[PDB]
Amino acid sequence: DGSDGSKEFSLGMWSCLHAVLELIDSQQQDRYWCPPLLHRAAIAFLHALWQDRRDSAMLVLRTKPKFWENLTSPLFGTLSPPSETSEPSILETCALIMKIICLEIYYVVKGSLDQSLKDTLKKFSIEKRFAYWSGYVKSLAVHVAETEGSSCTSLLEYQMLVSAWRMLLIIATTHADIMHLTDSVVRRQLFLDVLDGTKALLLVPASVNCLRLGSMKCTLLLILLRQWKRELGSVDEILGPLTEILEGVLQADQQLMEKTKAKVFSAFITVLQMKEMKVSDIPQYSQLVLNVCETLQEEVIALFDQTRHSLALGSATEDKDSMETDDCSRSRHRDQRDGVCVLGLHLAKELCEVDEDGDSWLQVTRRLPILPTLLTTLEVSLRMKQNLHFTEATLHLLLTLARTQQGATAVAGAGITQSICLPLLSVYQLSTNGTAQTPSASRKSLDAPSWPGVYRLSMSLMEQLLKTLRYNFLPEALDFVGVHQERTLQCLNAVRTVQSLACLEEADHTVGFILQLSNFMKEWHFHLPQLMRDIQVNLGYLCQACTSLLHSRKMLQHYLQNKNGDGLPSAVAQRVQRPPSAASAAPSSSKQPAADTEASEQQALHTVQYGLLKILSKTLAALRHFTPDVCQILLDQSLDLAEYNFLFALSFTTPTFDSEVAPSFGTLLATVNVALNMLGELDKKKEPLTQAVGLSTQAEGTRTLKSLLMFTMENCFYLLISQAMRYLRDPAVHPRDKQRMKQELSSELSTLLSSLSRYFRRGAPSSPATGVLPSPQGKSTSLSKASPESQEPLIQLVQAFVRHMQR
Amino acid sequence: NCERRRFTNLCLDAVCGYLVELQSMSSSVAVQAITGNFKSLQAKLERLH
Amino acid sequence: IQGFLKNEKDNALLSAIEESRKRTFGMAEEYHRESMLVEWEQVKQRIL
């Protein structure tokens, strides 16, 4: 019994551990040679006590003087090489001591560990025993590749030392602070000894033992690679042995080596992700892309018929009880995120960002039937709502390829539109049998794989293919917009009700594809003379919705807040009257609210305001292609007006966020005032905070948001002038309200141009502004620099229109 | 197409190596001619890059 | 410790696929987002 209500345990007069503690004492091994098969047996008993969580014994060993010094003393010995006849009970002894160290550092979470152990791990690092045992578990893995096909007896003890060394090193990354493994040169040696020491076991494709040990070290290699992807300060030493490991792993059985092909592709993706690289660098790139695409043709065909046997074996059940542990025969679904198919697609999608002209990759895919092979499996996956990770990964590879003229023509010539257009209808289609909605939409990432994500990537792929191929993908884009016409019209409206960031990310691609397609207005009007006008109307309401939300920044904050907290119904209401007072009293306790809540709500609000601004910019450009150009409708009187709709109503009322309110010239005047106030906050946030490090991309976001804010204003002014001339010409628009239009726009374009000229006399981000900026340096004539007062074209064009309204 | 700009470096570096070797040799009419041939080759590779 | 070594293998497969998918989405959006502005500067320099 303890003074503090705890129980003490002690090694009593008949404890077995008194004899175990003598058998391992270095300071009696100075006197009585404990032969290694007996030291092994004493250490095996200590491994079981640490495995089988007998902590009432472990506590009573942790408290023994010299325990960790005597117990670890064989790890401070030296061994003969594997080519000399050492006693394998010593290899087991060292492997079992490594297991005890692993279990103790894992269970005794980062604090309560013994100080003689903490300074023993420190001693192991100072004596560089990491580098010694690294070199030994390297050479012992070459020796197995040199002695398989002989009756090499100690192979089980060799497997025990290789598995114990794997366990020790994954703890020496995650607990590097307790293992004292903080020398990046020793980490680089440990990585290369695990790389070479994996290669030797994977270049023997006939040896089940080498394949097993090499696949187990490949599990270590892949962890060390990711935890050290800042200290492996060269890439080009790693790619060679990974190609040699791949080409060995492709000469061996798929049913074992699935669980190695995946690890090797996962390593290659991680290595390509460390450095900006080109086809000039990579060892045998033209064979590596062959090896990867031929592996993908095992995988995508095995997935294709897996998705067809799931179409023949009808009405399996929701078999929901089985609390059972890691056994065989239960079937391998190939649509796993870490499956060889899905990792091969992502590796191909990294490698397609290294070959700039596509000229190296197309010299593989002119051999292999692979592009239509991917599309036929995608076509079934989309029809069945099966194979989500593969479906998304295939669309990622296609979206990478569609950027180059060689990749886009290869994707189009593979039949892309047929294998997506009708299958993709399934994805967003709902069942008409209405039942319960499951609220389990917990806070996962916006990059969690999803069926809406598959639709967004299909829209992004058609935005990309039409941007690259134009007239040579225009029928395909018209059939696609006509088939997807419901989802196109839904997503133009979804911003009116579902202001969530994942919905804004769908709407921007829908308006993006529309912005690529409205370049072909007369061709679109010939084939789809309904839908093009229904899109003009819904783009009009999307302009009203985005501008009223971006203006009403408090209503946007409230629409987020009122969809970020849940769970209480009540009704019936009625009224009125009064408190008060009072008691009382006491006591405690003190936590604070997190300012990180106001920071994260503001960061969500700034990202939602950026999403709404992208959509508004794309909408204002897409709508401009549905009006005659400002130059045409100013300068030619033979230009017809029946070819062009009224897209804005003759009001100057500011835009309400409001269900039926059609967009107006007051909506356009509000869009410019929104952009002026946002630009007018980006030149407030300029006070000198310091000592933060590591974020570059906020400089780029401060650039791209400012060029976007210009694009929102300037296409809005093009719509304003074009539609104002569309009203001022027209023979039915009443002369009273033509004169009203001249008057109310002559006032608010004058107030806006007075505000624009009060901004631009600071300089927009430009080469003239950068040339005017100097003062200690860079000056000529007296105090001038470059040349000043080159004006921006909007300030001339809106002047010319205001002058002509004042005629 | 992609190989060609890796190869013109390696060919210039190798031509420089062979020209260091040749310029250590006893300067016979053959060593003089081949030093001319490799510098004529250099003076074309200096346009292939 | 086996569940932890399962999880370390899982994160050592899973995470670079999300880094690759983040690269595709970012490099597609950034190419549409800047092309639209290089197209717009070609509009402004025509207006000038």
Curated annotation (Swiss-Prot), chain A:
Residues modified as Phosphothreonine: T770
Feature: compositional bias, Polar residues: 777-790
Where can this protein be found? Nucleus, Nuclear pore complex
* Disordered as annotated region, ranges: 572-600, 765-791
Positions carrying Phosphoserine are S581, S767, S775
Q: Show the ranges annotated as biased composition (Low complexity).
A: 579-595
The record's comment on protein family reads: Belongs to the Nup188 family.
Per the entry, what this protein does is: Component of the nuclear pore complex (NPC), a complex required for the trafficking across the nuclear envelope. Required for proper protein transport into the nucleus.
Disorder association: Copy number variations of NUP188 gene may be a cause of heterotaxy, a congenital heart disease resulting from abnormalities in left-right (LR) body patterning.
Assembly and oligomerization? Part of the nuclear pore complex (NPC).
Q: What is this protein called?
A: Nucleoporin NUP188
Source species: Homo sapiens
Q: Which gene encodes it?
A: NUP188
Q: Which residues of the full protein are shown?
A: 943 to 1749 of 1749
Swiss-Prot record, chain B:
- The organism's superkingdom is given as Eukaryota
Q: Where in the cell is it found?
A: Nucleus, Nuclear pore complex; Nucleus membrane
PTM field: Phosphorylated. Phosphorylation and dephosphorylation may be important for the function of NUP155 and may play a role in the reversible disassembly of the nuclear pore complex during mitosis. Disulfide-linked to NUP62. The inner channel of the NPC has a different redox environment from the cytoplasm and allows the formation of interchain disulfide bonds between some nucleoporins, the significant increase of these linkages upon oxidative stress reduces the permeability of the NPC.
Expressing tissues: Expressed in all tissues tested, including heart, brain, placenta, lung, liver, skeletal muscle, kidney and pancreas.
* Record: disease: Atrial fibrillation, familial, 15: A familial form of atrial fibrillation, a common sustained cardiac rhythm disturbance. Atrial fibrillation is characterized by disorganized atrial electrical activity and ineffective atrial contraction promoting blood stasis in the atria and reduces ventricular filling. It can result in palpitations, syncope, thromboembolic stroke, and congestive heart failure.
As for what it does, the entry says: Essential component of nuclear pore complex. Could be essessential for embryogenesis. Nucleoporins may be involved both in binding and translocating proteins during nucleocytoplasmic transport.
By sequence similarity, the record places it as follows:
Belongs to the non-repetitive/WGA-negative nucleoporin family.
Q: How does it assemble?
A: Interacts with GLE1. Able to form a heterotrimer with GLE1 and NUP42 in vitro. Forms a complex with NUP35, NUP93, NUP205 and lamin B.
Protein name as annotated = Nuclear pore complex protein Nup155
**Species in which this protein is naturally found:** Homo sapiens
Q: Which residues of the intact protein are shown?
A: 1343 to 1391 of 1391
Curated annotation (Swiss-Prot), chain C:
Location in or out of the cell = Nucleus membrane; Nucleus, Nuclear pore complex; Nucleus envelope
Top-rank taxon of the source lineage equals Eukaryota
Q: Which disease is it linked to?
A: Nephrotic syndrome 12: A form of nephrotic syndrome, a renal disease clinically characterized by severe proteinuria, resulting in complications such as hypoalbuminemia, hyperlipidemia and edema. Kidney biopsies show non-specific histologic changes such as focal segmental glomerulosclerosis and diffuse mesangial proliferation. Some affected individuals have an inherited steroid-resistant form and progress to end-stage renal failure. NPHS12 inheritance is autosomal recessive.
Instruction: Summarize the protein's role.
Output: Plays a role in the nuclear pore complex (NPC) assembly and/or maintenance. May anchor nucleoporins, but not NUP153 and TPR, to the NPC. During renal development, regulates podocyte migration and proliferation through SMAD4 signaling.
Assembly and partners? Part of the nuclear pore complex (NPC). Component of the p62 complex, a complex composed of NUP62 and NUP54. Forms a complex with NUP35, NUP155, NUP205 and lamin B; the interaction with NUP35 is direct. Does not interact with TPR. Interacts with SMAD4 and IPO7; translocates SMAD4 to the nucleus through the NPC upon BMP7 stimulation resulting in activation of SMAD4 signaling.
What family does the entry list? Belongs to the nucleoporin interacting component (NIC) family.
Its recorded name reads Nuclear pore complex protein Nup93
The gene behind this protein is: NUP93
Q: Which residues of the full protein are shown?
A: 98 to 145 of 819
